Write a protein that binds this DNA or RNA. Sequence first.
RNA 1: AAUACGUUCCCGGGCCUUGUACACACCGCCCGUCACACCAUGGGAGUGGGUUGCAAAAGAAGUAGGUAGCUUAACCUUCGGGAGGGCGCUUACCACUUUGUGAUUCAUGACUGGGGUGAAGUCGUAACAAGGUAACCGUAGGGGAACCUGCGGUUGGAUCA
RNA 2: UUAGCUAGUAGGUGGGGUAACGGCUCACCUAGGCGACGAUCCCUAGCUGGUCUGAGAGGAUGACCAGCCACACUGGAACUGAGACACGGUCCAGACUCCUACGGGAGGCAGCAGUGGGGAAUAUUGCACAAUGGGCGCAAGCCUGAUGCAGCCAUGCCGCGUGUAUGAAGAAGGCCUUCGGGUUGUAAAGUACUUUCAGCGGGGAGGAAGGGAGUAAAGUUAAUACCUUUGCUCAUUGACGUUACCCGCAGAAGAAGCACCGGCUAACUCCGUGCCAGCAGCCGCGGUAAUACGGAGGGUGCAAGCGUUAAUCGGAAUUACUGGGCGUAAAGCGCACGCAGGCGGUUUGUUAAGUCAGAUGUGAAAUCCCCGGGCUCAACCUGGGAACUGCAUCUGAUACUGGCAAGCUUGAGUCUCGUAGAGGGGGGUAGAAUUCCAGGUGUAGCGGUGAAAUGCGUAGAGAUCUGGAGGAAUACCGGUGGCGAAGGCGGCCCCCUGGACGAAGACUGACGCUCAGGUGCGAAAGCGUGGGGAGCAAACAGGAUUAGAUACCCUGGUAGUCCACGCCGUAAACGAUGUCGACUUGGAGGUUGUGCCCUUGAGGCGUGGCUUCCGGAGCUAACGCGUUAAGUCGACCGCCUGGGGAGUACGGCCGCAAGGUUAAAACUCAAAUGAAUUGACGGGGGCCCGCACAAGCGGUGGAGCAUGUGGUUUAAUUCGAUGCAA
RNA 3: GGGAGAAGGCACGCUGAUAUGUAGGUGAGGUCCCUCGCGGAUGGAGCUGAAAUCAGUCGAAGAUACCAGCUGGCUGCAACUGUUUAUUAAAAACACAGCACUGUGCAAACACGAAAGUGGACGUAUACGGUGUGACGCCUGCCCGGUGCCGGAAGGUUAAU
Lengths: 129, 122
Amino acid sequence: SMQDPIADMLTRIRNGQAANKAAVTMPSSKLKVAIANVLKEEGFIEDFKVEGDTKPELELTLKYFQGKAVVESIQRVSRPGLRIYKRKDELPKVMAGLGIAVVSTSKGVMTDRAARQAGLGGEIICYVA
Amino acid sequence: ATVNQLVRKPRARKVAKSNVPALEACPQKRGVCTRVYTTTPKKPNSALRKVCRVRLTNGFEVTSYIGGEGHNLQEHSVILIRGGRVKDLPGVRYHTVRGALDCSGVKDRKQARSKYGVKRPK
RNA sequence: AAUACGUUCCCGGGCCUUGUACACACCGCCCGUCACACCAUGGGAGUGGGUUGCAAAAGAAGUAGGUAGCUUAACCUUCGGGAGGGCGCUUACCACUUUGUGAUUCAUGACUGGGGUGAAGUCGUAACAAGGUAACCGUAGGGGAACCUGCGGUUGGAUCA
RNA sequence: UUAGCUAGUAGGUGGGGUAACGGCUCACCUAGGCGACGAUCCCUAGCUGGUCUGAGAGGAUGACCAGCCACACUGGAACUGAGACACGGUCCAGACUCCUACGGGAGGCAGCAGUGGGGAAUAUUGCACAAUGGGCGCAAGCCUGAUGCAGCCAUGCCGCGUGUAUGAAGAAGGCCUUCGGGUUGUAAAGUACUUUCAGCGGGGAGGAAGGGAGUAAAGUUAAUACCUUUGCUCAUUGACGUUACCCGCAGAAGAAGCACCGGCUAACUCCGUGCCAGCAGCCGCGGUAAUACGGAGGGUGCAAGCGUUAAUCGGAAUUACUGGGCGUAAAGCGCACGCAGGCGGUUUGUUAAGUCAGAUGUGAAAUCCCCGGGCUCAACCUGGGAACUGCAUCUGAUACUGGCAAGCUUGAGUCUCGUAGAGGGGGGUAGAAUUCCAGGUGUAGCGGUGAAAUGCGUAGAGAUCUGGAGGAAUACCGGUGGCGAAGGCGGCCCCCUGGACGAAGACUGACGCUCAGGUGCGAAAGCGUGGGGAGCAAACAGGAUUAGAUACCCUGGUAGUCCACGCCGUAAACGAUGUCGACUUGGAGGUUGUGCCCUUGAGGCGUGGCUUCCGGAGCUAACGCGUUAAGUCGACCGCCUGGGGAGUACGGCCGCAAGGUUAAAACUCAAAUGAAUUGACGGGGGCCCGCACAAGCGGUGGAGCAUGUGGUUUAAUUCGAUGCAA
RNA sequence: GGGAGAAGGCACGCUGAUAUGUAGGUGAGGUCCCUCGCGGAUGGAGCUGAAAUCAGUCGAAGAUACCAGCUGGCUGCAACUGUUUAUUAAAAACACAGCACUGUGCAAACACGAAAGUGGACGUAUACGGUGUGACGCCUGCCCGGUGCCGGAAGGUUAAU
Ligand SMILES: [Mg+2]
Ligand SMILES: [Mg+2]
Ligand SMILES: [Mg+2]
Ligand SMILES: [Mg+2]
Ligand SMILES: [Mg+2]
Ligand SMILES: [Mg+2]
Ligand SMILES: [Mg+2]
Ligand SMILES: [Mg+2]
Ligand SMILES: [Mg+2]
Ligand SMILES: [Mg+2]
Ligand SMILES: [Mg+2]
Ligand SMILES: [Mg+2]
Ligand SMILES: [Mg+2]
Ligand SMILES: [Mg+2]
Ligand SMILES: [Mg+2]
Ligand SMILES: [Mg+2]
Ligand SMILES: [Mg+2]
Ligand SMILES: [Mg+2]
Ligand SMILES: [Mg+2]
Ligand SMILES: [Mg+2]
Ligand SMILES: [Mg+2]
Ligand SMILES: [Mg+2]
Ligand SMILES: [Mg+2]
Ligand SMILES: [Mg+2]
Ligand SMILES: [Mg+2]
Ligand SMILES: [Mg+2]
Ligand SMILES: [Mg+2]
Ligand SMILES: [Mg+2]
Ligand SMILES: [Mg+2]
Ligand SMILES: [Mg+2]
Ligand SMILES: [Mg+2]
Ligand SMILES: [Mg+2]
Ligand SMILES: [Mg+2]
Ligand SMILES: [Mg+2]
Ligand SMILES: [Mg+2]
Ligand SMILES: [Mg+2]
Ligand SMILES: [Mg+2]
Ligand SMILES: [Mg+2]
Ligand SMILES: [Mg+2]
Ligand SMILES: [Mg+2]
Ligand SMILES: [Mg+2]
Ligand SMILES: [Mg+2]
Ligand SMILES: [Mg+2]
Ligand SMILES: [Mg+2]
Ligand SMILES: [Mg+2]
Ligand SMILES: [Mg+2]
Ligand SMILES: [Mg+2]
Ligand SMILES: [Mg+2]
Ligand SMILES: [Mg+2]
Ligand SMILES: [Mg+2]
Ligand SMILES: [Mg+2]
Ligand SMILES: [Mg+2]
Ligand SMILES: [Mg+2]
Ligand SMILES: [Mg+2]
Ligand SMILES: [Mg+2]
Ligand SMILES: [Mg+2]
């Protein structure tokens, strides 16, 4: 049974990057759009566009730099079997700063740098490197 | 495997018993010799080791191994026993320490005299 | 001189593939009763203790209640005593101790079952090759021993139409 | 492998009691309370700041000190006292010890010392209230085995010394040697220069602030009396204390040992033995060349310390939350359903419980860390800061999770129509075939094995034909074909029924996945009852091979295999791969639907369900998996932590029994393992060669003769060769 | 199901309050009623009347007389309840349900009867008779040399006639 749409999205994008897919279409959601916005604001994906009235679908387009995939590892940290919540001063640091850790906070779904600048924590979602 | 299983069943340890039970976590124990004799090692090497079945003070009776050459100890002799077993002898788990109350040291010893209780030569 | 149809076969050798629990490399490895020594264990008619449960008996001192007696410094008195107090007795709680029957644990116990390590021991070769009956799994029976047989399943089996 | 416990027990009314609330207690009434979020019971254990180890998370632990509790020979009790059910207070019972005139009494060092036993081990029956405090006293003043200090122990940490600069005749001796050499080695001897520490003799702080006696001033009253306070002057005070420290004396004196040297790990050569003596944490050494045993020489490490032992942490990612695996090494319940539980598609609004931000209190002191200071440095002490990762409250943030109310269909379930199927249960029917019964024809064999015999035969066997009796399964179809959760299911027909898929259509609206306990199904073998029994076949009888053969082989043969109802719940219950969701290149098929094309052939183009083979990326130790992943994830359950002992015993449950289930401990071992590689072997296969066989020829073994070998005899029959290769 | 009344324990007299006699049973007179008398809905005047708490009291003793289980453990036999030698043996002796074998197709076997006839049985192989063992759990292992029983009449002997 589908019990983690975010994990499904991460699996789909990782498989698309592995198999050299131009774009990966999938059912979308508000949290999926929020995560795709963060992924596009960091250059990890080309772009995305929601298509559909009753059943919206995200159509994320992958980015390939010199053949090799731009995103190296996308790992779901907080899974729906073990919730992980970290304070402002306890946020992780992927690849000592070269990677990002998406965090959903009170102000929205921002990144590590944005959360640290704003001065508030949140609960992590996944590491992108 | 999973946290949901581990909260129900905590990860138990793998505690193993000590190899020196008769000492009862004690560096030394005083005993009285009961059966001093000689035994033979197992298959890989043949020799004639010197062993002694000694009754410890607490009540345990064990088999030690006399180190070096020359031991005046006999039945009804007070000896001191420390840990450490002999690999090539089955059953022994302890060593009689020389220089004890009655265990005399090895004669004409020049090297490692402290391990056999030998006075420093003049 | 004779004979050589052909590799069907004995012997020795050369190449490929297959299986191997062998690598001083099959004159390999290796299994279990049986005897002897030692060690640690279960059963064991019973034996001696520790702890403790249940149902009771038990009433030293000490607390609270009761007063057929014994007496009385503070208060009152109408001057006789009164109120109150103490002693004694009794009732209620309780300790030591005692009786009956259980539970747990420790040591011991004739004898007995299984297990482990052993030194050129006795008996046979079940598994590892198609191990020469192909083994293994569950089960029932049988036998000194490894094991054998029947039933159901697997190839974690070698050759070939 | 401790599952039910609790009847003052849960609550209520009233009374009593405590300083205070309260079944704390009493009388009555209600039958409740705890418990798989571990009740009850057993063993062990003082708790915390802290300490060790660990980068961290964690593990171990409660030495000193500090905060709390309990205890004072054992047990019970009460009184005084604000404060006790009281270490040096009281009463009683029990043991111990002691005095006695025998009537009767005295005591509790788990205080400081110290004594006797235990142990491997734990200190002197030392000085002082001079200071910091306590108790009493207005004060002076007294007590203080707390405290301040002295003594012993290298028990731990820190510092210093045991001389330094010269010093090649490379002195002498020792070590080995290739006898030329090098090693000890600037090491030593000798010269020069210092005296830290130990000793002697002098000087000499600080821990001392306080107190008493007078005097000037202030507060007081009637008072200059008496008191308190503020300054002043002389008395004064130290157990440590021959104090710390400084200075002069002289002399290099009085001051270094232990462990190791084959690899792990830094260090090699001889001598003595010869699997004996002996070493060892592992690998292992010694059988005459031991760098491994003992000694010597030399070298390495540490140092007033050096090694062994006992415990803890690390390495051990070897209980893995950080940080593992389950196809083959250990690890998927045999399968399915499902309670509690775990998780959960998508949108809005609301709440803000988790989560996120800020503030407050607290998180003792002590300890760690950072910046400074004092001890001549350090150990040690100390000031500030940080930290104490936690908790409670308040004020906000609303993305996520959670609660609430509305929606949606993509998840899921249902209708309407067809399709295939050894899906299951029950009842009938038809042949092949085997075995017996009866009859006919028919004569000397039948059966069996590598070969034989047991066995059936002249009482007519086997064979043939006819009729009859009874049991099981249904040759070809028949396939890496189908169905079913698994086990499993194969003639045909009927009756009832479960499940799966597809064409198009609408709603139900998260109703969804997994599952500890629990229930159900569950190959064969096995047991009970009542039947059946043709063939096959455990046990068993006979024959046979073999040294033996309680087996393989042959001839018979009981349970069983069969039916109905019952019992166990075991398998290599295997795809050794637990259920579901989606994502991630292809080829060749198999089965079964469905849409459209000129369906001239099993013509083509798409789309579904199941399944087989090959294989790319990816994964794996490799074999191998590879869209039906063993590729990357998500939700859940179960299991694994070295091989034996052992899935064994005990214990609880189930079972008529066999047995099943839950499941250890002591002891031993240095391995036990799986995928693959190179050899070797196979009573495995394929191919090939050689006088190796097959077709010859001649000889050897038969009887003397010439030789060598073995044994015999002797003083020697000298020694060596001892399969083919003597 | 049992052992089990396991074993072992506390109260039992009398008086008073509860209640000058409770609960419970029986249960009249007063009021509607009828499909009207031997009737129903309320009604408790009564007599009867346990069982316990609280307090007191007397004796050494309150199931105070008569009546009225001794208990537990280890074992052999028999399953048990019964029956058996009237009149020395009551038991381990017989029976027993259960189990096995055998014969019995009805005009059945068998037994009493020279026979009729009857019982079996006015039953019909799940019935009857006989023989063995004797509830129930694990089983009944090998042997037909001999004597009985059954199946066969190939061969030998064989009465009466
Ligand atoms: Mg060649
Ligand atoms: Mg025993
Ligand atoms: Mg009493
Ligand atoms: Mg009394
Ligand atoms: Mg074999
Ligand atoms: Mg054989
Ligand atoms: Mg085999
Ligand atoms: Mg057999
Ligand atoms: Mg199977
Ligand atoms: Mg009250
Ligand atoms: Mg670590
Ligand atoms: Mg403590
Ligand atoms: Mg005292
Ligand atoms: Mg003392
Ligand atoms: Mg001692
Ligand atoms: Mg003082
Ligand atoms: Mg005094
Ligand atoms: Mg020299
Ligand atoms: Mg001073
Ligand atoms: Mg070494
Ligand atoms: Mg660890
Ligand atoms: Mg692992
Ligand atoms: Mg395995
Ligand atoms: Mg294996
Ligand atoms: Mg399975
Ligand atoms: Mg099972
Ligand atoms: Mg909140
Ligand atoms: Mg906060
Ligand atoms: Mg300093
Ligand atoms: Mg602190
Ligand atoms: Mg919400
Ligand atoms: Mg159907
Ligand atoms: Mg289950
Ligand atoms: Mg069966
Ligand atoms: Mg047969
Ligand atoms: Mg046979
Ligand atoms: Mg049967
Ligand atoms: Mg199993
Ligand atoms: Mg399995
Ligand atoms: Mg399920
Ligand atoms: Mg299928
Ligand atoms: Mg493949
Ligand atoms: Mg078992
Ligand atoms: Mg052969
Ligand atoms: Mg009444
Ligand atoms: Mg007897
Ligand atoms: Mg009887
Ligand atoms: Mg009997
Ligand atoms: Mg009787
Ligand atoms: Mg009699
Ligand atoms: Mg008749
Ligand atoms: Mg009998
Ligand atoms: Mg019987
Ligand atoms: Mg018999
Ligand atoms: Mg016969
Ligand atoms: Mg006859």
